Amino acid sequence: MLTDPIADMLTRIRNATRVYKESTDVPASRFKEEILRILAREGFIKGYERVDVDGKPYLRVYLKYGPRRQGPDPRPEQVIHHIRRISKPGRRVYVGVKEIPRVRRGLGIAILSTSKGVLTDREARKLGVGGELICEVW
Amino acid sequence: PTINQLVRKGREKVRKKSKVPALKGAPFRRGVCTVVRTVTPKKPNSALRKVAKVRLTSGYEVTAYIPGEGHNLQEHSVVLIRGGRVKDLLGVRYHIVRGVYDAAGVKDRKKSRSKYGTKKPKEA
RNA sequence: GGCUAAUCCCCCAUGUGGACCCGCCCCUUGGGGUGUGUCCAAAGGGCUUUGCCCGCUUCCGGAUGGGCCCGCGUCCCAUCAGCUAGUUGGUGGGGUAAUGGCCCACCAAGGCGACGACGGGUAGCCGGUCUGAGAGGAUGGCCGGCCACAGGGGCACUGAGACACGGGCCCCACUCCUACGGGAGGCAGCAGUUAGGAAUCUUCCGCAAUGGGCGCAAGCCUGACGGAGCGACGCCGCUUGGAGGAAGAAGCCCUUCGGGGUGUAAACUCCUGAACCCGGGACGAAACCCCCGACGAGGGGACUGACGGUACCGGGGUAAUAGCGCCGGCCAACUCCGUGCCAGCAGCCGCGGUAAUACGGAGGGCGCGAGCGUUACCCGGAUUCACUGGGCGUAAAGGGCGUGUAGGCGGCCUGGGGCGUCCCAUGUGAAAGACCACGGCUCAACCGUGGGGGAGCGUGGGAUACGCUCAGGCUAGACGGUGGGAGAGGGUGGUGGAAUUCCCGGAGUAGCGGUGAAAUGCGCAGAUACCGGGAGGAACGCCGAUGGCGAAGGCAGCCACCUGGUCCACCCGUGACGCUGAGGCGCGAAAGCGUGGGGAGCAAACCGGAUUAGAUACCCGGGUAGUCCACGCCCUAAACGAUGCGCGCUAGGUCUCUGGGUCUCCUGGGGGCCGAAGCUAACGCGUUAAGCGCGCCGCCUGGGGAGUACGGCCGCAAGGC
RNA sequence: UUCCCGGGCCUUGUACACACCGCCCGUCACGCCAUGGGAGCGGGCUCUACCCGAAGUCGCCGGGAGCCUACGGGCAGGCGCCGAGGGUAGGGCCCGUGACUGGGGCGAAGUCGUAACAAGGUAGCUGUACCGGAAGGUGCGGCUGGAUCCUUUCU
Ligand SMILES: [Mg+2]
Ligand SMILES: [Mg+2]
Ligand SMILES: [Mg+2]
Ligand SMILES: [Mg+2]
Ligand SMILES: [Mg+2]
Ligand SMILES: [Mg+2]
Ligand SMILES: [Mg+2]
Ligand SMILES: [Mg+2]
Ligand SMILES: [Mg+2]
Ligand SMILES: [Mg+2]
Ligand SMILES: [Mg+2]
Ligand SMILES: [Mg+2]
Ligand SMILES: [Mg+2]
Ligand SMILES: [Mg+2]
Ligand SMILES: [Mg+2]
Ligand SMILES: [Mg+2]
Ligand SMILES: [Mg+2]
Ligand SMILES: [Mg+2]
Ligand SMILES: [Mg+2]
Ligand SMILES: [Mg+2]
Ligand SMILES: [Mg+2]
Ligand SMILES: [Mg+2]
Ligand SMILES: [Mg+2]
Ligand SMILES: [Mg+2]
Ligand SMILES: [Mg+2]
Ligand SMILES: [Mg+2]
Ligand SMILES: [Mg+2]
Ligand SMILES: [Mg+2]
Ligand SMILES: [Mg+2]
Ligand SMILES: [Mg+2]
Ligand SMILES: [Mg+2]
Ligand SMILES: [Mg+2]
Ligand SMILES: [Mg+2]
Ligand SMILES: [Mg+2]
Ligand SMILES: [Mg+2]
Ligand SMILES: [Mg+2]
Ligand SMILES: [Mg+2]
Ligand SMILES: [Mg+2]
Ligand SMILES: [Mg+2]
Ligand SMILES: [Mg+2]
Ligand SMILES: [Mg+2]
Ligand SMILES: [Mg+2]
Ligand SMILES: [Mg+2]
Ligand SMILES: [Mg+2]
Ligand SMILES: [Mg+2]
Ligand SMILES: [Mg+2]
Ligand SMILES: [Mg+2]
Ligand SMILES: [Mg+2]
Ligand SMILES: [Mg+2]
Ligand SMILES: [Mg+2]
Ligand SMILES: [Mg+2]
Ligand SMILES: [Mg+2]
Ligand SMILES: [Mg+2]
Ligand SMILES: [Mg+2]
Ligand SMILES: [Mg+2]
Ligand SMILES: [Mg+2]
Ligand SMILES: [Mg+2]
Ligand SMILES: [Mg+2]
Ligand SMILES: [Mg+2]
Ligand SMILES: [Mg+2]
Ligand SMILES: [Mg+2]
Ligand SMILES: [Mg+2]
Ligand SMILES: [Mg+2]
Ligand SMILES: [Mg+2]
Ligand SMILES: [Mg+2]
Ligand SMILES: [Mg+2]
Ligand SMILES: [Mg+2]
Ligand SMILES: [Mg+2]
Ligand SMILES: [Mg+2]
Ligand SMILES: [Mg+2]
Ligand SMILES: [Mg+2]
Ligand SMILES: [Mg+2]
Ligand SMILES: [Mg+2]
Ligand SMILES: [Mg+2]
Ligand SMILES: [Mg+2]
Ligand SMILES: [Mg+2]
Ligand SMILES: [Mg+2]
Ligand SMILES: [Mg+2]
Ligand SMILES: [Mg+2]
Ligand SMILES: [Mg+2]
Ligand SMILES: [Mg+2]
Ligand SMILES: [Mg+2]
Ligand SMILES: [Mg+2]
Ligand SMILES: [Mg+2]
Ligand SMILES: [Mg+2]
Ligand SMILES: [Mg+2]
Ligand SMILES: [Mg+2]
Ligand SMILES: [Mg+2]
Ligand SMILES: [Mg+2]
Ligand SMILES: [Mg+2]
Ligand SMILES: [Mg+2]
Ligand SMILES: [Mg+2]
Ligand SMILES: [Mg+2]
Ligand SMILES: [Mg+2]
Ligand SMILES: [Mg+2]
Ligand SMILES: [Mg+2]
Ligand SMILES: [Mg+2]
Ligand SMILES: [Mg+2]
Ligand SMILES: [Mg+2]
Ligand SMILES: [Mg+2]
Ligand SMILES: [Mg+2]
Ligand SMILES: [Mg+2]
Ligand SMILES: [Mg+2]
Ligand SMILES: [Mg+2]
Ligand SMILES: [Mg+2]
Ligand SMILES: [Mg+2]
Ligand SMILES: [Mg+2]
Ligand SMILES: [Mg+2]
Ligand SMILES: [Mg+2]
Ligand SMILES: [Mg+2]
Ligand SMILES: [Mg+2]
Ligand SMILES: [Mg+2]
Ligand SMILES: [Mg+2]
Ligand SMILES: [Mg+2]
Ligand SMILES: [Mg+2]
Ligand SMILES: [Mg+2]
Ligand SMILES: [Mg+2]
Ligand SMILES: [Mg+2]
Ligand SMILES: [Mg+2]
Ligand SMILES: [Mg+2]
Ligand SMILES: [Mg+2]
Ligand SMILES: [Mg+2]
Ligand SMILES: [Mg+2]
Ligand SMILES: [Mg+2]
Ligand SMILES: [Mg+2]
Ligand SMILES: [Mg+2]
Ligand SMILES: [Mg+2]
Ligand SMILES: [Mg+2]
Ligand SMILES: [Mg+2]
Ligand SMILES: [Mg+2]
Ligand SMILES: [Mg+2]
Ligand SMILES: [Mg+2]
Ligand SMILES: [Mg+2]
Ligand SMILES: [Mg+2]
Ligand SMILES: [Mg+2]
Ligand SMILES: [Mg+2]
Ligand SMILES: [Mg+2]
Ligand SMILES: [Mg+2]
Ligand SMILES: [Mg+2]
Ligand SMILES: [Mg+2]
Ligand SMILES: [Mg+2]
Ligand SMILES: [Mg+2]
Ligand SMILES: [Mg+2]
Ligand SMILES: [Mg+2]
Ligand SMILES: [Mg+2]
Ligand SMILES: [Mg+2]
Ligand SMILES: [Mg+2]
Ligand SMILES: [Mg+2]
Ligand SMILES: [Mg+2]
Ligand SMILES: [Mg+2]
Ligand SMILES: [Mg+2]
Ligand SMILES: [Mg+2]
Ligand SMILES: [Mg+2]
Ligand SMILES: [Mg+2]
Ligand SMILES: [Mg+2]
Ligand SMILES: [Mg+2]
Ligand SMILES: [Mg+2]
Ligand SMILES: [Mg+2]
Ligand SMILES: [Mg+2]
Ligand SMILES: [Mg+2]
Ligand SMILES: [Mg+2]
Ligand SMILES: [Mg+2]
Ligand SMILES: [Mg+2]
Ligand SMILES: [Mg+2]
Ligand SMILES: [Mg+2]
Ligand SMILES: [Mg+2]
Ligand SMILES: [Mg+2]
Ligand SMILES: [Mg+2]
Ligand SMILES: [Mg+2]
Ligand SMILES: [Mg+2]
Ligand SMILES: [Mg+2]
Ligand SMILES: [Mg+2]
Ligand SMILES: [Mg+2]
Ligand SMILES: [Mg+2]
Ligand SMILES: [Mg+2]
Ligand SMILES: [Mg+2]
Ligand SMILES: [Mg+2]
Ligand SMILES: [Mg+2]
Ligand SMILES: [Mg+2]
Ligand SMILES: [Mg+2]
Ligand SMILES: [Mg+2]
Ligand SMILES: [Mg+2]
Ligand SMILES: [Mg+2]
Ligand SMILES: [Mg+2]
Ligand SMILES: [Mg+2]
Ligand SMILES: [Mg+2]
Ligand SMILES: [Mg+2]
Ligand SMILES: [Mg+2]
Ligand SMILES: [Mg+2]
Ligand SMILES: [Mg+2]
Ligand SMILES: [Mg+2]
Ligand SMILES: [Mg+2]
Ligand SMILES: [Mg+2]
Ligand SMILES: [Mg+2]
Ligand SMILES: [Mg+2]
Ligand SMILES: [Mg+2]
Ligand SMILES: [Mg+2]
Ligand SMILES: [Mg+2]
Ligand SMILES: [Mg+2]
Ligand SMILES: [Mg+2]
Ligand SMILES: [Mg+2]
């Protein structure tokens, strides 16, 4: 099957961006949609789209990079420098409000899934909820 | 390993053996020379090394090394064992503490004297 | 044997009340209420003596202290895998303050265990302590809490309470008394002795304080306790001096013989004034008691200090102990003699075999200082058990392969619930400790007061994104229908030619074979070389491949049956049916085993011929098991891609096997080579990953000892795990 | 230009690097040393069956078998269950001891060969089997972690 939907999302993005692709289809979910909404508003993807490929629902994820590097290796600086899953099917991670990490000196974020819904560490913290810690981004 | 492996079996704390049974956990143990003599060292080194097989309050009969420049020990001297070993000859897990029980201290030693157990000398 | 008193023991009454059987009321496990019968009380003593005090009695509460019971937590070994007869439950009963097989009688046949039962080993738990960035690890001396013990084992009695450390009984061991009959003990209370050990204190003062027993009070008892003593055992404070003082003394070390060093260090000069002497001298102690009031509230009065003539205060006063480890690199600190693989050092690299910063002494230096070294033990480093935070192609490490059991994991949409999860309130989280703040000892250590934090569990309330679960629905995963494939995939019957050997026959003449050379061997009983026939066994040239199938092992002539897997088309059906898999079970090259067959070539062992110093070998001649079949065992391997399975994502190019295709080419599924990104220690890998990710299983943790010993299991054995 | 000697350049294999006069494996003997394996012997704990069984609580008798008595009953005392513990016979643990005894170290590389590493001079390795003074040979499979396309040891 696909054992983590989400991981595989994050990954698609990762190998996508590493190879500098202008964007990518990922197979569609209300949740995976939340996550990219957050991921987007928060600066990391150009934005995304709800597409249909071969009669099946996909989300296109458009993809942003920084400008052209000089010298040898002109490959431009990544925006999504790193993205990684935290909670994993059969090993879960749930955090108090006092336990919500904070990321790369605040230069990145966490994504939490709460009963206030999906939100960033900062958002949770001001909201005052905890939840499953989905992912590290920075 | 997976997680479900760590829950299933899970990691193994591993313990360490002792480099010595002075037993007791004792810091030192009293003994009696059974025999005393001189041995040849190991690998690159030549020497005549000074040592005494000693019988113990801990019940075992061991080989200990008599440190420093002269010594006084013979058939049944009685002596104290501290342990710490000698790499260059083998079977010696322990040193004799000089200056205790029937073992003298090394006399004339000016230089490092707590080890070797010699009293501080006076002058004018 | 005999008198005798009481707050000792009885009997009768009173019954506020309580107890018990039966009935009903409310309530919900044996909680209350009530009626009927029954059963149950008591003790005096003192005075300021007719009313007060200390007591007794029955009931109902409080308070404090406990019993008992449940959830959860709570070390190593699976080389401990099964355990259980009061065992597990039931009815009745014994018993107890109370539940309960706690025990007992009779019924039932259960209880427990890989979520580790039973067995073995070890150990008192905890608040806390040590270490660590943390997570963890390690620990449970002192102080508080809880448990257990009181020479070893049983037992009960009295009692509110014990199955009682200075109470009782019996057995045992030991010691002591003994008229040998029989008796007496129990320091794991404080001191102290002895033994053991590397090692652990005074047979001290006091009952002033605090605390406990009894007492109306006075008081009495208190090795609890307050104090003192001894040990650098620790921690903290303090001292062995402060300012001057040479271009820089002697001695001593080094020397390129000019000078360098110890070193402002000394000497000396001038202040101060540890020790010590004199004087004065605590707080810790104010109640119990007594007086007025009312034995209350309140007020007044009296006594009492082990520590101690100590703390502290004032006066006087002397220049007044320094040591230990290090100086090759880790590591701060160098030179001269001595020594010559010796004597010695050594934590590890390693030093010493005549120029040793590494041994030993010297001068000098570095580090700490009433201490400094050492050995021992814990945590650290050690991300070297890796939750944070490792790995497995060659470094240690992927099981030989497969099937699935337990178990772990789980696509897309909607609704219910709200277990996980998140939040809020609240209760608990004793004190001590840690943290912060002020404060008390001249500081500090040590001590007080306050504040803060807290995981965790109980309770109430709330949220529903993710996990679960229940209900519905969908089709991208999985499977199924239809259609089209290819293939040494497997089992059984079958047949076909080539060659080897042997038998038969023909012709046919002296050698063939073999090697580096040769001998052995076979040949005139006519071999080799040739033709014809026959028998028999095994294996399948060419096609054939840098091909194909299969899970691995492995599988090649041809035909027939039996039968597994698999790929592509069509988008037809089901509707998440999915992945993985401990254990289990089944396969499993060769050699090997058992019983029966078979036996042409080949061939361990063997038997000979060579070679060689020898030749238990490589070369030659021969040959047995075995190789082949059948049934049954065996279960290993460089069982190799030395690379577990599944799923998804990430340039290409070229070669190839097999499908479909509007057929330069496109589109699936295999096999190969080069290579983008990226990974790797490198070599290499690279859409057939060793890249980026998720699930699940196996496995590793220096080399040797050793795949040995031991135990268990398997096997006929060899031997396997 | 094949060979002998020395040499240059490219390449290849190495387990050599005081570098092929390098490296290395196995067997023996007598000392001597710790270790480990181990019958029998002595000790300890435990479990099962059987028998003897103190103290004590509980049961039951408590009798023209004793003492008190309101004759209701009590007490002495007696018998039984259980029971610390012992005894006899068996399993299992653990300790001490121990004849006999496998591998390791040094005595001294001492010996006999030359097994492996270079095509190690017959490629090596492997499971298994038989042989053999010893490394070993050899047979059958299998792997490549295999050079390049007479025999002749040891420093
Ligand atoms: Mg929480
Ligand atoms: Mg890990
Ligand atoms: Mg040397
Ligand atoms: Mg003597
Ligand atoms: Mg040491
Ligand atoms: Mg001394
Ligand atoms: Mg030294
Ligand atoms: Mg009388
Ligand atoms: Mg009444
Ligand atoms: Mg009544
Ligand atoms: Mg009455
Ligand atoms: Mg009374
Ligand atoms: Mg009250
Ligand atoms: Mg109460
Ligand atoms: Mg209570
Ligand atoms: Mg209670
Ligand atoms: Mg019964
Ligand atoms: Mg029984
Ligand atoms: Mg009952
Ligand atoms: Mg049963
Ligand atoms: Mg413990
Ligand atoms: Mg214990
Ligand atoms: Mg700390
Ligand atoms: Mg750690
Ligand atoms: Mg901790
Ligand atoms: Mg503990
Ligand atoms: Mg103690
Ligand atoms: Mg305590
Ligand atoms: Mg308690
Ligand atoms: Mg006891
Ligand atoms: Mg007790
Ligand atoms: Mg005693
Ligand atoms: Mg007892
Ligand atoms: Mg009483
Ligand atoms: Mg009682
Ligand atoms: Mg008692
Ligand atoms: Mg006592
Ligand atoms: Mg007695
Ligand atoms: Mg004592
Ligand atoms: Mg002694
Ligand atoms: Mg004391
Ligand atoms: Mg006294
Ligand atoms: Mg008092
Ligand atoms: Mg008092
Ligand atoms: Mg009183
Ligand atoms: Mg009075
Ligand atoms: Mg007394
Ligand atoms: Mg005291
Ligand atoms: Mg002392
Ligand atoms: Mg001392
Ligand atoms: Mg001490
Ligand atoms: Mg001078
Ligand atoms: Mg001078
Ligand atoms: Mg001065
Ligand atoms: Mg002056
Ligand atoms: Mg003065
Ligand atoms: Mg006076
Ligand atoms: Mg006072
Ligand atoms: Mg006062
Ligand atoms: Mg009093
Ligand atoms: Mg008083
Ligand atoms: Mg009055
Ligand atoms: Mg009065
Ligand atoms: Mg008063
Ligand atoms: Mg007063
Ligand atoms: Mg006095
Ligand atoms: Mg005085
Ligand atoms: Mg003064
Ligand atoms: Mg003065
Ligand atoms: Mg002076
Ligand atoms: Mg002076
Ligand atoms: Mg240091
Ligand atoms: Mg240095
Ligand atoms: Mg000498
Ligand atoms: Mg000289
Ligand atoms: Mg020399
Ligand atoms: Mg010299
Ligand atoms: Mg030299
Ligand atoms: Mg030196
Ligand atoms: Mg040194
Ligand atoms: Mg020196
Ligand atoms: Mg010095
Ligand atoms: Mg100090
Ligand atoms: Mg110290
Ligand atoms: Mg350590
Ligand atoms: Mg660390
Ligand atoms: Mg590692
Ligand atoms: Mg792996
Ligand atoms: Mg290797
Ligand atoms: Mg390996
Ligand atoms: Mg494999
Ligand atoms: Mg293997
Ligand atoms: Mg498997
Ligand atoms: Mg499977
Ligand atoms: Mg399942
Ligand atoms: Mg889901
Ligand atoms: Mg819902
Ligand atoms: Mg919930
Ligand atoms: Mg609701
Ligand atoms: Mg509490
Ligand atoms: Mg606290
Ligand atoms: Mg804190
Ligand atoms: Mg202060
Ligand atoms: Mg404090
Ligand atoms: Mg607090
Ligand atoms: Mg709090
Ligand atoms: Mg805390
Ligand atoms: Mg806490
Ligand atoms: Mg709470
Ligand atoms: Mg809702
Ligand atoms: Mg599930
Ligand atoms: Mg459904
Ligand atoms: Mg159709
Ligand atoms: Mg078909
Ligand atoms: Mg067709
Ligand atoms: Mg077919
Ligand atoms: Mg076939
Ligand atoms: Mg076929
Ligand atoms: Mg076939
Ligand atoms: Mg024939
Ligand atoms: Mg013929
Ligand atoms: Mg003829
Ligand atoms: Mg001839
Ligand atoms: Mg022949
Ligand atoms: Mg022949
Ligand atoms: Mg002939
Ligand atoms: Mg002949
Ligand atoms: Mg003739
Ligand atoms: Mg013939
Ligand atoms: Mg003949
Ligand atoms: Mg003829
Ligand atoms: Mg012929
Ligand atoms: Mg023919
Ligand atoms: Mg035949
Ligand atoms: Mg034929
Ligand atoms: Mg192939
Ligand atoms: Mg194969
Ligand atoms: Mg078929
Ligand atoms: Mg098919
Ligand atoms: Mg359809
Ligand atoms: Mg359909
Ligand atoms: Mg449908
Ligand atoms: Mg399996
Ligand atoms: Mg097989
Ligand atoms: Mg075979
Ligand atoms: Mg056979
Ligand atoms: Mg046969
Ligand atoms: Mg032959
Ligand atoms: Mg031969
Ligand atoms: Mg030769
Ligand atoms: Mg010969
Ligand atoms: Mg042959
Ligand atoms: Mg046979
Ligand atoms: Mg055989
Ligand atoms: Mg597997
Ligand atoms: Mg076609
Ligand atoms: Mg392909
Ligand atoms: Mg690259
Ligand atoms: Mg990686
Ligand atoms: Mg490549
Ligand atoms: Mg992959
Ligand atoms: Mg790798
Ligand atoms: Mg390791
Ligand atoms: Mg080892
Ligand atoms: Mg083996
Ligand atoms: Mg064993
Ligand atoms: Mg065995
Ligand atoms: Mg057997
Ligand atoms: Mg074998
Ligand atoms: Mg196996
Ligand atoms: Mg195996
Ligand atoms: Mg040449
Ligand atoms: Mg040239
Ligand atoms: Mg090389
Ligand atoms: Mg040679
Ligand atoms: Mg030796
Ligand atoms: Mg032994
Ligand atoms: Mg032995
Ligand atoms: Mg015995
Ligand atoms: Mg009996
Ligand atoms: Mg009578
Ligand atoms: Mg009677
Ligand atoms: Mg009875
Ligand atoms: Mg009995
Ligand atoms: Mg018994
Ligand atoms: Mg033993
Ligand atoms: Mg030997
Ligand atoms: Mg060795
Ligand atoms: Mg040797
Ligand atoms: Mg060979
Ligand atoms: Mg070999
Ligand atoms: Mg060789
Ligand atoms: Mg060879
Ligand atoms: Mg050959
Ligand atoms: Mg072989
Ligand atoms: Mg042979
Ligand atoms: Mg072969
Ligand atoms: Mg090879
Ligand atoms: Mg080849
Ligand atoms: Mg050649
Ligand atoms: Mg030799």
Curated annotation (Swiss-Prot), chain A:
GO terms for molecular function: rRNA binding; structural constituent of ribosome. The keyword Ribonucleoprotein applies. The keyword Oxidoreductase does not apply. InterPro entries: Ribosomal_uS8 (IPR000630), Ribosomal_uS8_CS (IPR047863), Ribosomal_uS8_sf (IPR035987). One of its GO terms (cellular component) is ribonucleoprotein complex. One of its GO terms (biological process) is translation. Pfam families: Ribosomal_S8 (PF00410). Keywords: Ribonucleoprotein, Ribosomal protein, RNA-binding, rRNA-binding. One of the primary rRNA binding proteins, it binds directly to 16S rRNA where it helps nucleate assembly of the platform of the 30S subunit central domain. The combined cluster of proteins S8, S12 and S17 appears to hold together the shoulder and platform of the 30S subunit. Part of the 30S ribosomal subunit. Contacts proteins S2, S5 and S12. Belongs to the universal ribosomal protein uS8 family. This is Small ribosomal subunit protein uS8. It comes from Thermus thermophilus (strain ATCC 27634 / DSM 579 / HB8).
